[PDB]
Amino acid sequence: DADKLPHTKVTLVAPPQVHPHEQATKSGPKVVEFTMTIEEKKMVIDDKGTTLQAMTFNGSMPGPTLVVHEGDYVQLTLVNPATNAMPHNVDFHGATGALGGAKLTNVNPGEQATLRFKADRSGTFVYHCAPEGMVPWHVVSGMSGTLMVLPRDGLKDPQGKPLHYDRAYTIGEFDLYIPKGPDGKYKDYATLAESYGDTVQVMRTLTPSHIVFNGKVGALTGANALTAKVGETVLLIHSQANRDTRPHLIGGHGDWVWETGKFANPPQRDLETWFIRGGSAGAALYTFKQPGVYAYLNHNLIEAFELGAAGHIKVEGKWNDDLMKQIKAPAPIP
Amino acid sequence: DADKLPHTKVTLVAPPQVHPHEQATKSGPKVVEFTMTIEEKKMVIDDKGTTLQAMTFNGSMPGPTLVVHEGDYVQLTLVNPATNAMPHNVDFHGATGALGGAKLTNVNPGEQATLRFKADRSGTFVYHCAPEGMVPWHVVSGMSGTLMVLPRDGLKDPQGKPLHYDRAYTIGEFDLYIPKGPDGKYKDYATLAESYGDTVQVMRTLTPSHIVFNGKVGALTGANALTAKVGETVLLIHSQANRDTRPHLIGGHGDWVWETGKFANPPQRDLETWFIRGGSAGAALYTFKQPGVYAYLNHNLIEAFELGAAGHIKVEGKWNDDLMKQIKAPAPIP
Amino acid sequence: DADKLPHTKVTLVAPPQVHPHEQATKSGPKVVEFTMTIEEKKMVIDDKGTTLQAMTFNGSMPGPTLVVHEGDYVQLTLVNPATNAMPHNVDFHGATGALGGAKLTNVNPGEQATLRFKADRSGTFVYHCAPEGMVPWHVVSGMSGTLMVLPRDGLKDPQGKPLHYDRAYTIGEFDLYIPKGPDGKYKDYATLAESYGDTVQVMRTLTPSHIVFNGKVGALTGANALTAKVGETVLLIHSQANRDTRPHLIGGHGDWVWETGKFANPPQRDLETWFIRGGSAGAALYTFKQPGVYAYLNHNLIEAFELGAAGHIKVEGKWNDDLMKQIKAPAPIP
Amino acid sequence: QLDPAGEKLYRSACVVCHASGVANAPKLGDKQAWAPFLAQGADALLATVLKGKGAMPPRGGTAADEATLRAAVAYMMDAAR
Ligand code: HEM
Ligand SMILES: [Cu+2]
Ligand SMILES: [Cu+2]
Ligand SMILES: [Cu+2]
Ligand SMILES: [Cu+2]
Ligand SMILES: [Cu+2]
Ligand SMILES: [Cu+2]
């Protein structure tokens, strides 16, 4: 009974990092308490000054990743400050009943609510805002993130062998639908609500204007590239709350991948490209064997390079000539 | 030798219901006889009065679901009444040879044909019309449904444990390509043939005007909502003959899912969202744990809420606070 | 040590054939040497005379399939003749490091380079050109193919039983983005560079003008149809370097399918339709049981029949009435 | 006579809640739901829009001027007649 269990409060961290956790644990079930505060804000989403009238959990796209273990209870306090214009709520795909909690978390500006649910299924699960009557707008504008429910003794391969990651990154991919005006330029809006009508027109074409990792073109590049080292095992959590994507690590692989994101199923190995269904989160493990800069991207290459769905991972370590060697560098044909 | 096998006759029922069947059976192979009659008709596909010049098996979109067991022979009498304008046929993805039977079932208006094939592979399989040179039009106009071939021993989990359902529902998802006129309104055509040219132009854009479950926006709502009780196991069969979809039960899960639809493969568990490839049928089992009205939808939320790909399941029973509890109702921020 | 290992040279063949290989082999690991020469050229891609300013490996779309065995090393000499206009390189999804080899194989016209990498993961893997800042254009213009890395022991089913094919075919599916002029006619360009800007605009709409198997509408039909016979087992390798596809054999099945294309994972059986993620290659086995002309296609039927993503397989042999029988040929309704 | 600016504002913003009834917003064209509002009169309705009420943010969450808001209220009232 949840009321009798120890309660732990967790401090969330901004994507792409994930809050410190346990993988395999000897602890039994607990109630894990989290708080998120909704923030509506205009955000610049590309290199060319284009703005989105955005909606976020905790000020970020995606919202922060919440980690518990299978059998824990998630207890979320959801705060909607009086400074916001719209009502919001939360739907956890990891939860059972009441439209994922959406029916129990309807908060107008100036209100808050607390939901508890049992995280009785292991895996990475999307959570997202779902206000009745305006669901897609809130999702596409930025209101989604991941809940990760780890098996109590950690991840396992198809034969039951233990898999352990040294670091976890969370990547939320966002299909954006920014209206253009008749002059052919992207529209900038004074308020969130004024953006709606023109945005739904674009939504109905099913053609995103931009598709971005973590809230903007190049969010996960340059100074903000992900990082790793040869020998390090990374977990790459990938959420897409609205539209399909196909993650690929250029020069790497998914060593073990749960593309449907549910840890009680055996993972697939050696993937070049995997597939995240719109409305889900999946997870991939990779152990780096080569240093260098990698691209992590949606392998519809138009979506990646033209529309924005690409990031980098900068990897330190020793080059391995057995795995790959330049035999003859580029030179004139004989 | 299928000549010499006993015959049985099935009375088909309209979606979302599925005709009564055995799961596990002590019967051996039989020749199972079905009849379907083609109906071309103008249909209203939303509550606004928008029309489609539709083509159907047995008067419905999707056509009825046909259930046999692995090793049975399906013997279909296909009738194309004189009232119709177009030639039709049937291609069973569950059949082997002659383009799924299409080459052997070409029926002009005022003709009928009888096809027998061995259902030697277990799974949910699409059937659809496929008249040479006209395939996409007939399919997107409504001519598809599902053949379910159950293992003779019933459904099994990955360890070979028996899985039983209390009721089966069949959902056919249809991407529609309805032309618009200069006034921005959907076009209404006096005859099926008159709709052809304009419809082909819309199809080539690859952008559906509507995406509907069972022939209409909100088809699976109100008196025609799916129903269940807490403790009941439902099998949700989902067909998409032309385009990908990503089913999701809001507030629920796919307890056991065969997303590629083929029962000799182990199912996956605990899914939030699954994936039905265009040109296939898949199936998910779920046991209800909470009462309430669930949404069952395509989790491209634009496709669901803007274009029509969403329905309801109304579930009776007692609320479970252990699984989910509103700890604090929406109230002012302290 | 890869040096010191025996070297062998393989002569490539044009799609849809695949160069003679070994499945299960008694051979130890070797360095397998290949050469490919890049060819930029104007190609007619449909039966109306529409042209593509194309770029190819070895003069074909897709490039040839390279077969080794797990533990072999691939050593590719890539040649960019002085007759070409653009720099090129190669990214092997089968490889580990340096953006798949792209960083090590940047060749200007008049240059060549030699790359070695260890093929340490079994499966079918895309290779494609990836010049920095120019990746999507080079890929959609034709620069992709398949590397097949067979397990040393050959293909195996989920229970570890040997699977063997009699012939392999390789199909590359290409989503093309051909610009139109003010008159609504496809543009025809004097030079490759000339096509660039207009093509990028079409790409950004995410809507292909054409989707073709092996470089043109109807490439795999008529005199050029694939062939087999009843009792013969065929491997169908399907690559799509940029965009998702859903292969289906009309009147057949995927007996054993690795849709993500990685042979250390168990295959699924009895598939009606499978799914190749954009940026990947998958593989299906089928043993023919019926003679006749089959269609092999992308089962978005608009993509297949309207846009070009369809081929034929002509199959010799004896009709099997047990599997399918015309009980009553089309005849007038009484 | 209505002004086109009202419908335009409605279609850009107000529609997000009033098309269906987000947070129990009276739906556009709902004759019975709107009867008591019509009886309050246009000035009262406009005052409520400017102030905000429940889940409806001040100015219906727009930066429109009073005249444009009046026009949108007028369009909404018209649809309910
Ligand atoms: C300028 C655009 C808008 C206009 C002209 C408008 C108009 C109106 C009017 C005339 C009323 C009746 C006043 C009353 O109930 O006494 C009303 C009520 C309401 N509106 Fe709006 N509205 C707009 C925007 C919005 C938006 C964006 C929302 C959603 C965030 C919304 C939600 C509501 C709700 C919930 C009510 C009922 C208030 C209650 O009884 O608690 N409205 N609106
Ligand atoms: Cu929200
Ligand atoms: Cu959801
Ligand atoms: Cu037909
Ligand atoms: Cu088909
Ligand atoms: Cu190139
Ligand atoms: Cu690639």
mmCIF file of N, CA and C in Angstrom, chain B residues 93-134:
data_model
loop_
_atom_site.group_PDB
_atom_site.id
_atom_site.type_symbol
_atom_site.label_atom_id
_atom_site.label_comp_id
_atom_site.label_asym_id
_atom_site.label_seq_id
_atom_site.Cartn_x
_atom_site.Cartn_y
_atom_site.Cartn_z
ATOM 1 N N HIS B 93 -4.357 -11.437 -48.367
ATOM 2 C CA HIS B 93 -2.956 -11.560 -47.936
ATOM 3 C C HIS B 93 -2.674 -12.868 -47.200
ATOM 4 N N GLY B 94 -3.736 -13.524 -46.737
ATOM 5 C CA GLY B 94 -3.585 -14.803 -46.056
ATOM 6 C C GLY B 94 -3.489 -15.987 -46.999
ATOM 7 N N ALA B 95 -3.673 -15.735 -48.302
ATOM 8 C CA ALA B 95 -3.687 -16.785 -49.345
ATOM 9 C C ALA B 95 -2.381 -16.832 -50.132
ATOM 10 N N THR B 96 -2.141 -17.980 -50.767
ATOM 11 C CA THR B 96 -0.944 -18.175 -51.569
ATOM 12 C C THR B 96 -1.319 -18.475 -53.028
ATOM 13 N N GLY B 97 -0.884 -17.597 -53.936
ATOM 14 C CA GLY B 97 -1.064 -17.784 -55.384
ATOM 15 C C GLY B 97 -1.967 -16.744 -56.024
ATOM 16 N N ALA B 98 -1.812 -16.587 -57.340
ATOM 17 C CA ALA B 98 -2.752 -15.812 -58.170
ATOM 18 C C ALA B 98 -3.084 -14.435 -57.622
ATOM 19 N N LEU B 99 -2.043 -13.714 -57.195
ATOM 20 C CA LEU B 99 -2.195 -12.370 -56.616
ATOM 21 C C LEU B 99 -3.173 -12.332 -55.426
ATOM 22 N N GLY B 100 -3.081 -13.357 -54.572
ATOM 23 C CA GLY B 100 -3.960 -13.495 -53.398
ATOM 24 C C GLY B 100 -5.384 -13.935 -53.720
ATOM 25 N N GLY B 101 -5.594 -14.369 -54.957
ATOM 26 C CA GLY B 101 -6.923 -14.754 -55.419
ATOM 27 C C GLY B 101 -7.508 -13.760 -56.402
ATOM 28 N N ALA B 102 -6.881 -12.586 -56.540
ATOM 29 C CA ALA B 102 -7.418 -11.530 -57.404
ATOM 30 C C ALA B 102 -7.595 -11.975 -58.865
ATOM 31 N N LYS B 103 -6.662 -12.787 -59.379
ATOM 32 C CA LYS B 103 -6.733 -13.251 -60.780
ATOM 33 C C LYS B 103 -7.903 -14.196 -61.041
ATOM 34 N N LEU B 104 -8.445 -14.769 -59.967
ATOM 35 C CA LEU B 104 -9.459 -15.835 -60.054
ATOM 36 C C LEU B 104 -10.845 -15.348 -59.641
ATOM 37 N N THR B 105 -10.944 -14.066 -59.294
ATOM 38 C CA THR B 105 -12.184 -13.520 -58.752
ATOM 39 C C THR B 105 -12.608 -12.209 -59.434
ATOM 40 N N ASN B 106 -12.147 -11.988 -60.674
ATOM 41 C CA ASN B 106 -12.539 -10.790 -61.413
ATOM 42 C C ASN B 106 -14.027 -10.868 -61.743
ATOM 43 N N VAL B 107 -14.839 -10.063 -61.054
ATOM 44 C CA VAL B 107 -16.295 -10.070 -61.269
ATOM 45 C C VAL B 107 -16.789 -8.709 -61.758
ATOM 46 N N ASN B 108 -17.399 -8.712 -62.937
ATOM 47 C CA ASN B 108 -18.061 -7.521 -63.448
ATOM 48 C C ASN B 108 -19.411 -7.391 -62.780
ATOM 49 N N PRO B 109 -20.014 -6.191 -62.826
ATOM 50 C CA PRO B 109 -21.383 -6.049 -62.290
ATOM 51 C C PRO B 109 -22.326 -7.113 -62.875
ATOM 52 N N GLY B 110 -23.064 -7.789 -62.001
ATOM 53 C CA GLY B 110 -23.965 -8.866 -62.408
ATOM 54 C C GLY B 110 -23.312 -10.239 -62.430
ATOM 55 N N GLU B 111 -22.089 -10.333 -61.894
ATOM 56 C CA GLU B 111 -21.344 -11.597 -61.818
ATOM 57 C C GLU B 111 -20.934 -11.937 -60.392
ATOM 58 N N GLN B 112 -20.714 -13.231 -60.154
ATOM 59 C CA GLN B 112 -20.159 -13.767 -58.908
ATOM 60 C C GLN B 112 -19.117 -14.851 -59.192
ATOM 61 N N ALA B 113 -18.280 -15.157 -58.209
ATOM 62 C CA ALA B 113 -17.240 -16.181 -58.368
ATOM 63 C C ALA B 113 -17.014 -16.826 -57.009
ATOM 64 N N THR B 114 -16.497 -18.052 -56.998
ATOM 65 C CA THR B 114 -16.206 -18.729 -55.725
ATOM 66 C C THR B 114 -14.729 -19.147 -55.709
ATOM 67 N N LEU B 115 -14.013 -18.738 -54.664
ATOM 68 C CA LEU B 115 -12.575 -19.007 -54.531
ATOM 69 C C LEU B 115 -12.362 -19.852 -53.279
ATOM 70 N N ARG B 116 -11.509 -20.871 -53.355
ATOM 71 C CA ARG B 116 -11.094 -21.573 -52.144
ATOM 72 C C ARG B 116 -9.597 -21.410 -51.957
ATOM 73 N N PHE B 117 -9.143 -21.144 -50.739
ATOM 74 C CA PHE B 117 -7.702 -21.223 -50.490
ATOM 75 C C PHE B 117 -7.402 -21.794 -49.127
ATOM 76 N N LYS B 118 -6.211 -22.354 -48.983
ATOM 77 C CA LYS B 118 -5.792 -22.907 -47.700
ATOM 78 C C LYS B 118 -5.238 -21.792 -46.806
ATOM 79 N N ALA B 119 -5.807 -21.677 -45.609
ATOM 80 C CA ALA B 119 -5.349 -20.717 -44.612
ATOM 81 C C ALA B 119 -4.287 -21.405 -43.785
ATOM 82 N N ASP B 120 -3.081 -21.490 -44.344
ATOM 83 C CA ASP B 120 -2.043 -22.281 -43.723
ATOM 84 C C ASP B 120 -1.107 -21.482 -42.814
ATOM 85 N N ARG B 121 -1.367 -20.185 -42.660
ATOM 86 C CA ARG B 121 -0.518 -19.347 -41.793
ATOM 87 C C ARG B 121 -1.372 -18.572 -40.804
ATOM 88 N N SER B 122 -1.001 -18.613 -39.526
ATOM 89 C CA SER B 122 -1.778 -17.948 -38.481
ATOM 90 C C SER B 122 -1.488 -16.453 -38.453
ATOM 91 N N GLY B 123 -2.500 -15.681 -38.087
ATOM 92 C CA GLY B 123 -2.345 -14.243 -38.044
ATOM 93 C C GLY B 123 -3.593 -13.503 -38.483
ATOM 94 N N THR B 124 -3.540 -12.192 -38.306
ATOM 95 C CA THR B 124 -4.524 -11.284 -38.893
ATOM 96 C C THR B 124 -3.931 -10.816 -40.226
ATOM 97 N N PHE B 125 -4.713 -10.928 -41.309
ATOM 98 C CA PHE B 125 -4.263 -10.603 -42.664
ATOM 99 C C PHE B 125 -5.280 -9.689 -43.343
ATOM 100 N N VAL B 126 -4.795 -8.661 -44.021
ATOM 101 C CA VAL B 126 -5.666 -7.807 -44.821
ATOM 102 C C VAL B 126 -6.234 -8.600 -46.005
ATOM 103 N N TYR B 127 -7.496 -8.334 -46.347
ATOM 104 C CA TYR B 127 -7.985 -8.660 -47.696
ATOM 105 C C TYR B 127 -8.438 -7.345 -48.319
ATOM 106 N N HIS B 128 -8.336 -7.231 -49.643
ATOM 107 C CA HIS B 128 -8.747 -5.985 -50.311
ATOM 108 C C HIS B 128 -9.023 -6.234 -51.781
ATOM 109 N N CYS B 129 -9.785 -5.329 -52.381
ATOM 110 C CA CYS B 129 -10.036 -5.390 -53.817
ATOM 111 C C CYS B 129 -8.766 -4.945 -54.508
ATOM 112 N N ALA B 130 -8.508 -5.491 -55.697
ATOM 113 C CA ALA B 130 -7.309 -5.152 -56.452
ATOM 114 C C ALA B 130 -7.554 -5.295 -57.962
ATOM 115 N N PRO B 131 -8.458 -4.469 -58.521
ATOM 116 C CA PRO B 131 -8.712 -4.589 -59.947
ATOM 117 C C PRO B 131 -7.544 -3.988 -60.725
ATOM 118 N N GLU B 132 -7.056 -4.712 -61.719
ATOM 119 C CA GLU B 132 -5.862 -4.283 -62.447
ATOM 120 C C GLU B 132 -5.976 -2.851 -62.947
ATOM 121 N N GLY B 133 -4.976 -2.031 -62.630
ATOM 122 C CA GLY B 133 -4.948 -0.619 -63.052
ATOM 123 C C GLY B 133 -5.745 0.331 -62.172
ATOM 124 N N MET B 134 -6.492 -0.230 -61.229
ATOM 125 C CA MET B 134 -7.341 0.577 -60.363
ATOM 126 C C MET B 134 -7.167 0.295 -58.876
#
